[PDB]
Ligand binder design. Structure first.
Ligand SMILES: CC(C)(C)c1cc(NC(=O)Nc2cccc(-c3c[nH]c4ncnc(N5CCOCC5)c34)c2)n(-c2ccc3ncccc3c2)n1
Length: 335
């Protein structure tokens, strides 16, 4: 046991925790501390993720809050059946709160990056979407809101793939063998590209925030690239307007950030570097359909309804789980 003045724990591959956890790898780091891989010698050689949070205090406090959140998700989920990440253990170790999870596979972003940003096929989209909706419905019902939904926070149970590619000129694609996912959270709300306009405009958010993000995420699974490829609010709102249509007067009246607008409209210099990028790449949403086909149109219908500007007219996760799009699930996918 040795601590540095930043507080954090100095651990080495081969160190043991709770006489059952043998560190074998490294999986992450962040504000709060490390995230290592162990084999659980108690539960018999099997593999876990272990977020370590040492001293600091706010860290320890927030770790407790996380554990509680995850405790409550288990209690409220009997059969594991709501597709959130599952805490298998937690403990206290010379001040360092630790939280063990079953080790899942690559997240939906990584997998996409490993596939050279070749989009997932429409059935995978459909299945992943169904589970994201189910999962966040369950969370919303228990007065919980993710707020930082994004592809990196969706993990595949198993990210093994069957590489398969013929005929297509440069066919070289990986289909993941099993599209089951789990929702995690690594820990202005949201990440830029998944952030909804009410957060951008500082109008307060609630559950409808998660739906907007889901909307954004589905698009990315479907095209391989992000729907809003930008890093600044004004551009982002302009992009919203050209992809989706105008912004309700009512949301412009309530913005205290009265800098992006002028006389009811977004200030926007159509002929700049930013101007040209938007002009030569942002087209109306429907135009990004890859095929002229019912299930693709169903998907864009759910997507448009998920990306309503007004959080109050935006579809709920309950209403989406009943959207025709989800007719095409295999019966097995249905659970
Ligand atoms: C259920 C919900 C809502 C989605 C959630 C999940 C988590 N925690 C989490 O995902 N933790 C976590 C932390 C570290 C690893 C993994 C993880 C679980 N399997 C894995 N299988 C493989 N790799 C993993 N990753 C390692 C790299 O890195 C991403 C996950 C993992 C998961 N939280 C959460 C998080 C932080 C909080 N802070 C304060 C208050 C409340 C908090 C709640 N809420």
């Amino acid at each position: 046991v040795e601590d540095d003045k930043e507080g954090h724990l100095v651990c080495r591959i081969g160190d043991w925790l709770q006489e059952r956890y043998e560190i074998v790898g490294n999986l992450g780091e962040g504000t709060f501390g490390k995230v290592v891989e162990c084999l659980d010698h108690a539960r018999g050689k099997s593999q876990v993720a272990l977020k370590i949070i040492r001293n600091v205090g706010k860290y320890r406090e927030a770790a407790r809050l996380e554990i509680n959140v995850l405790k409550k998700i288990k209690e409220k989920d009997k059969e594991n059946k709501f597709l959130c990440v599952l805490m298998s253990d937690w403990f206290n170790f010379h001040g360092h709160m630790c939280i063990a999870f079953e080790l899942l596979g690559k997240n939906t972003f990584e997998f996409l990056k490993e596939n050279n940003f070749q989009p997932y096929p429409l059935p995978h989209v459909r299945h992943m979407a169904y589970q994201l909706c189910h999962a966040l419905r369950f969370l919303h019902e228990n007065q919980l809101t993710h707020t930082d939904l994004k592809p990196e926070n969706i993990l595949f149970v198993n990210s093994e793939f069957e590489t398969l590619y013929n005929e297509h000129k440069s066919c070289e694609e990986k289909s993941v063998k099993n599209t089951s996912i789990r929702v995690a959270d690594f820990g202005i709300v949201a990440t830029r590209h998944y952030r909804p306009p009410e957060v951008i405009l500082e109008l307060g958010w609630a559950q409808p925030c998660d739906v907007w993000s889901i909307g954004c995420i589905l698009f990315e699974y479907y095209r391989g690239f992000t729907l809003f490829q930008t890093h600044e609010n004004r551009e982002h709102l302009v992009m919203m307007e050209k992809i989706l249509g105008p912004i309700p007067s009512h949301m412009i009246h309530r913005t205290r950030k009265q800098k992006y607008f002028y006389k009811g409209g977004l200030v926007w210099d159509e002929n700049s570097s930013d101007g040209r990028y938007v002009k030569e790449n942002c087209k109306p949403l429907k135009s990004y359909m890859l095929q002229d086909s019912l299930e693709h149109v169903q998907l864009f219908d759910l997507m448009r309804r998920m990306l309503e500007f007004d959080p109050a007219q935006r579809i709920t996760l309950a209403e989406a789980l009943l959207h025709p799009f989800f007719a095409g699930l295999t019966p097995e996918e249905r659970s």
